[PDB]
Amino acid sequence: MLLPWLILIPFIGGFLCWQTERFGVKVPRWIALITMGLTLALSLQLWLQGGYSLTQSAGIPQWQSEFDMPWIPRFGISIHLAIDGLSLLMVVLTGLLGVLAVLCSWKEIEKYQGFFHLNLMWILGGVIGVFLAIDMFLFFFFWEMMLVPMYFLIALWGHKASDGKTRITAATKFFIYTQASGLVMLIAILALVFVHYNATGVWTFNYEELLNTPMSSGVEYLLMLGFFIAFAVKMPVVPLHGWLPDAHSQAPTAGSVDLAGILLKTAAYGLLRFSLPLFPNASAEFAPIAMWLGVIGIFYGAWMAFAQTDIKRLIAYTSVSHMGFVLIAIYTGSQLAYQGAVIQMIAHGLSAAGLFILCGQLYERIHTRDMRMMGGLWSKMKWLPALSLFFAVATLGMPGTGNFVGEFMILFGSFQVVPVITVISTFGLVFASVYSLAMLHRAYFGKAKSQIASQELPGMSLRELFMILLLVVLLVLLGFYPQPILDTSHSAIGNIQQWFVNSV
Template sequence: MLLPWLILIPFIGGFLCWQTERFGVKMPRWIALITMGLTLVLSLQLWLQGGYSLTQAAGIPQWQSEFVMPWIPRFGISIHLAIDGLSLLMVVLTGLLGVLAVLCSWREIEKYQGFFHLNLMWILGGVIGVFLAIDMFLFFFFWEMMLVPMYFLIALWGHKASDGKTRITAATKFFIYTQASGLVMLIAILALAFVHFNATGVWTFNYEDLLKTPMSHGVEYVLMLGFFIAFAVKMPVVPLHGWLPDAHSQAPTAGSVDLAGILLKTAAYGLLRFALPLFPNASAEFAPIAMWLGIIGIFYGAWMAFCQYDIKRLIAYTSVSHMGFVLIAIYTGSQLAYQGAVIQMIAHGLSAAGLFILCGQLYERLHTRDMRQMGGLWSKIKWLPALSMFFAVATLGMPGTGNFVGEFMILFGSYKVVPVITVISTFGLVFASVYSLAMLHRAYFGKAKSEIAAKELPGMSLRELSIVLLLVVLLVLLGFFPQPILDTSHAAMSNIQQWFVNSVSTTRP
């Protein structure tokens, strides 16, 4: 019974935040914090229950806990939620970053506090819904539902870009990209249900029934592309990444944390959970194209990050580069690479969140995100530059941080399957060090600008320091002890890999 509450608590909490604004400015903040804290505690409670290590030989999904309630029985649509190791880890990450998102926007947001927290909570509720829903119609419902609050978050509380673009432009661009790709996925989901109905005479949107849908090769390929396009926009895969730099750089800090830490992961999760198992033959055929797109993303993201002067745009492009590794891992069909992809997603969520939170703190002090206006800050602000340096080296895959474990496992697992692509993508790590060090150099070293040199900049407050230190501790723990995460995700990844490999080697039932 815990599963529906994981989704309901953020929705109810968000509504309360909105309504209690009239009783004082502090109320919504505290309610939002308690709401996300409760969600995080519930997800950890599910983790402690255990039962995530069961695998099935055929690779049929094995759920640790399920919740089913009929919704529109005529079309076989039900409220069907289920959790396994993969979705559990993503839900815990969402809960954790949700708490941090509320904390880091404590001082930043001045106007419409209640409505801000309503949007923030509803995005997180929608994301948890995406990770738990295994009825395809319900999955789509949550997938679309997290867009509208994100639009408001960027449009109402965003910052103006350093190149003069407005936040409304960024929000609209994000909305059009994701809405259009969502439409493609809706058509693919409906077509899949229709193909299933033609074959069996039963209307259903249930994931486990649709796994066994017989279909011709051409139909499978077209439907797989429908899913791939929707996930590729969200992930984002170059050339469908146009919304990302603007949305990231203009969103408020909490929005950036959610975008980089969680929203991009919904796409990788969707590919692993739906695109591969539902269309294994088409995915195997499409794999080389997807991997080359991943490589283009790695290099393009790194190169564009190096060229940026806006510090938030720089971090946004690093996400494009990192998700390229995840994309390559997803299409290798290697168990080790899949496990690496999970670690990489969690580590990237933590390190990108850390960088965005530090950028928000810099912006509160300097009121600029342009690195040409910075420089010489190393001795000016206590703690902040050193912590930025930690996250920058974590981003480039420093041993001892979770990012290294993820990238190493991805490269190691992919090498057996696609040696050429793996060797090329390894060079992406070299470029990662270039943009990370360039960011540090431009912002914190060199000669201080006269207006900054004259200013007295406050050090980090206890709240700011504790948020960032928590992320530091988690990243280092993930770097030294990834085993609990690997144990939790192992069965889920093994099931996906078995189903994918077995279905490719035999024809579909």
């Protein structure tokens, strides 16, 4: 019921901001803040009003709210929006990140600003629609239309048409690397539906009847690779992640909040929801390749993070290290491991968003991007580097932050299922420390005479500090007290694991 409205407010707000662009220029900032407030209101209403602590073994079909509507009846394509417990965590996270995106874009007036915000709400609404998606075509359409408006963001707002490096390399690799694999998973969807159409005799694009379709061995394996390729180019996996640092280092850091904190979520959401239950034996065969790619991703991202000299590419290469833990979590037979991935995933978004906001904040203070050029700014800034120290501290497994409990319950479940690949995996924490300290010492520890421009520094406004203070206190409560959201996700995680166990 609430789901059609909850995916449509982003699109309605873009229309109204661009409508009132003719009326005024200070309107869309204040319009956008209220519209994202309504998005979190409906999302938090579903958290509180709904039975978040529901039955742990109520089957694979279980939803607090559900919407159905005929869209293309010839294939049974329907607007099958349906919200689960873990999907509701995803919706509340993106509503909060949308508030941060529209708050960081405050006091940013240009030649056109309504165009920026209709695009801003369009891309955030696309991610919400992926998170509420049970029909395969609706899932794919939303997956691919959140991908078009970021291209305009990197192009027309990466820099205003002055340098050609903001389109022809950064934005173009971002677009092609995702869309080729999106078309791969579309033909994977179609091969799965056609083998189901031979089995039963109905053209259906719905998840519940495609869940248990009879397929011979050696056939569903190729479709599982087809799903995983599109789910491995969106979250950074080892062979195909070259788009991520270019995308984050060129887009404005509000666009980078969208590009890191929430676009990385949807691929592991799809690995939990759409790839694991549909292909149980194929995923059981593919598991060790996934573990090898996971350990390679953690070690690889940390080394590339240590070796880099700038900051946006630095945090962009932390992200590929973080997601390796999540991939190994998903491809195991443990309930605790999956519940560790969820808390690690929410904390991943919350620990990347603050760093990107602050890195963009530091650049507009000093007008210099290279990290090794500055140094010793602690005597000049009064609140930026202290808050930045805790966010760099929250990146690695420091307890009292959500990242520690996240990565570390994965390791418990991972050692429960398989010893040797887990005992390799744990060493990324040592490597997490070295790139964390490298960031901290090269940027803030030292003498302010490392740069001439490090001798005249501005002040920090109240609202940026307010939205940084909220994230640090929110992230500490998730580290100390993670029970409420684990009780929320228990049943959804449990039935996925029980199906992955029982179907093999």
